[PDB]
Design a protein around this ligand. Structure first.
Ligand SMILES: CCc1n[nH]c2oc(=O)c3ccccc3c12
Length: 115
């Protein structure tokens, strides 16, 4: 009950790798991605993005034990970063940060392929 299954441990490790990542200056890139603002605060996002995603949604799904494999969680992260890179321009910091975290995600999945 305290003890997570191997799949649960792996899901958590991937999630935490993205969440905890800090650049060389100590900035936690996940900060902005934790929770989307509301429809009144970010209207153009909701009018243009088909499938809203934030890390709270991912975390809630993980904590409900609803991901069956690592690929399913990775797909939600990838959706989130592609959403960020669709809504925001390439010159923007949120776009750039999404690309870094997307690399962190994939590198973490690859680092754990034998686990
Ligand atoms: C202002 C917050 C923000 N602007 N553009 C965004 O794109 C996103 O994909 C996203 C995902 C989770 C939390 C915030 C944002 C976001």
């Amino acid at each position: 009950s305290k003890y997570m299954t191997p799949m649960q441990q792996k899901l958590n490790e991937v999630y935490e790798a993205v969440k905890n990542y800090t650049d060389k200056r100590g900035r936690r890139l996940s900060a902005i991605f934790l929770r989307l603002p509301s429809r009144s605060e970010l209207p153009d996002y909701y009018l243009t993005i088909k499938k809203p995603m934030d890390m709270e949604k991912i975390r809630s799904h993980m904590m409900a034990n609803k991901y069956q494999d690592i690929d399913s969680m990775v797909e939600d992260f990838v959706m989130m970063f592609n959403n960020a890179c669709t809504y925001n321009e390439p010159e923007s910091l949120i776009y750039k940060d999404a690309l870094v975290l997307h690399k962190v995600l994939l590198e973490t999945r690859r680092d754990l392929e034998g686990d």
